[PDB]
């Protein structure tokens, strides 16, 4: 099996659909990655995650290095064995969470409480976890930022990107079996995004993430930045938008050339009682669902919608029952995967523009 | 299919093993019933409950009448449809929980806050839920109690038992498709237990519960009372010990003629980090399991023990992850079902005495 082989099968405008072949499996793109923070996709067994259609999940380096610890997970046989997911795992670098969840920043890296993270240590931690797609250690520039502060931050991220590349390449077993993605920064500024893209391309990565855009800038601004940022990245490698997003965010980002996504929304909002449907999100705890015998979504193919009603799930979530969180989460992840499948098929079939319009019309109605 | 047919296939001492055939399925005895309080066996899909070997689950009349409500569940198609469990369900009468969870007691029944429960209303609620085994509405005498107070309480329960019988029999659809169990009371007093047994037998029930013994009297005292109480009940009907218990409680009660059990222990203690093993319970959060790659129990056949380590489950429970509760609960219910299976097979094979001794020796070691 290939270490990493990205093939584009079809295009429509800026949108692409295809596959990433890796040693632990094939990733169909555009892809959505369920987030598995503390070595679990919350409230789901791995077989259930797979049953929804997920090809790859995301693990969080920051969380796992603290609990249970990277060396410990390696001693226990790696993250795949540990959590019982045998397909690809992408690990974030810890660069974002080290700032949002903990700090002292310097050229060497970040020291923090509740430890030190550097490009080299991040790569080593991801090696110990046995990650399939390794993220370069970066800095998520706060939003908003002055052009000059965004520039100095992006430039540090680019130096860290080179250091991540070198650390990764130095570890033969990692270089042979895993892939490395670089992260574009530059805030909302076109010239900095270009400088960042050029720096990353000069180094060379297996894939390129658009970083710094899951920062509450709003969809309009996010799209504006994607409009010029994604074409700067190498066309022949995957484009990964970190931390995005709602279903309409995803459709628009794919329209702008994004191939990969991760977001806690389907899992987290699922536990909180929000279910995604083709007619938009619903709050299942709302009184209007108390005697509603329809499934969460009446076109959804997931196991939850085959078996249980809105009324039942309403009851569970209001009662604080774990099964409520389980069913909501499975449905939401399945919905996200069905969305990605519809996206992939429509691009392949050259009807993605129509799909996007049809989707938005119904979802917002 | 039979409404209710109890067959004893084999005996050893006071212990029996056999089957209860009902319209929604066969119940292998001795049986353990997972408790499904608010129309869910906590943290388990019904298919998972079934996969562990459970033939029947328990639903709680008190909880369900408040949330989502009995008439509502009936409107939604009954409890079986509502929660997606199509096999037998035994419903408790609400008689215990109305006192422990809420009161005004009278001959008519119990009025309470956070409503009124009577033998007739209890039976009607259980009818609306679509219960397969209906419990007579009773009074769980507090422990300890004077002989005279235990007597007046038991006598009220016996009058309520007759009223439950009459209400059940009046509802043709219920009488044709469900079964009715009476509940023996009398605290720890032999003469009152006898009076109670005689009263219940005079009325006639499909099964007989030993009530009033899940009250913190200790195992020695519980066994003492079972020693004389169970032989008072009709031999040819099932004997149900409500709210019991730990694995050794169950083995001893079967040695004393009990055929059916329910307990929240495997589910509740599972979520709290206690896993049952053949070498006794373990607290999975304990530091000694942090790098333990063995399954929860190395003889257990459950899906959890086929796939995940102690170390992983340790990590999940310490992290407050829902999957931790899911895996612990599935294992614990599976352990309980494997215990019942070993009990059934050993009685059938005429080696139950040896099994009980072997079990106790290892479990307490
Ligand atoms: N490492 C990194 N992570 C994220 C990020 C932000 C929000 C949700 C998820 C990831 N953004 C970045 O620019 N870098
Ligand atoms: N209805 C009833 N329930 C119980 C009971 C006690 C503890 C746990 C479960 C049931 N004991 C009784 O004597 N009657
Ligand atoms: Zn669904
Ligand atoms: Zn097990």
Swiss-Prot record, chains A, B:
Effect of residue 138 to A: Abolishes catalytic activity
Residues annotated for Zn(2+) binding in this entry: 300, 302, 305, 331
The record's free-text note on cofactor binding: Binds 1 zinc ion per subunit.
Cofactor: Zn(2+)
Highest taxon above the source species: Bacteria
One GO term (biological process): tRNA wobble guanine modification
EC number annotated for this UniProt entry: 2.4.2.29
Pathway in which this enzyme or protein is active: tRNA modification; tRNA-queuosine biosynthesis
GO cellular component: cytosol
Region (RNA binding): 243-249, 267-271
Catalytic activity: 7-aminomethyl-7-carbaguanine + guanosine(34) in tRNA = 7-aminomethyl-7-carbaguanosine(34) in tRNA + guanine
Keywords noted in UniProt: Glycosyltransferase, Metal-binding, Queuosine biosynthesis, Transferase, tRNA processing, Zinc
UniProt-annotated binding residues for substrate: 92-96, 138, 185, 212
Catalytic residues (positions): 92 (proton acceptor), 262 (nucleophile)
PANTHER family registered for this protein in UniProt: QUEUINE TRNA-RIBOSYLTRANSFERASE
Function: Catalyzes the base-exchange of a guanine (G) residue with the queuine precursor 7-aminomethyl-7-deazaguanine (PreQ1) at position 34 (anticodon wobble position) in tRNAs with GU(N) anticodons (tRNA-Asp, -Asn, -His and -Tyr). Catalysis occurs through a double-displacement mechanism. The nucleophile active site attacks the C1' of nucleotide 34 to detach the guanine base from the RNA, forming a covalent enzyme-RNA intermediate. The proton acceptor active site deprotonates the incoming PreQ1, allowing a nucleophilic attack on the C1' of the ribose to form the product.
Subunit structure: Homodimer. Within each dimer, one monomer is responsible for RNA recognition and catalysis, while the other monomer binds to the replacement base PreQ1.
Protein name: Queuine tRNA-ribosyltransferase
Organism the protein comes from: Zymomonas mobilis subsp. mobilis (strain ATCC 31821 / ZM4 / CP4)
Primary gene name: tgt
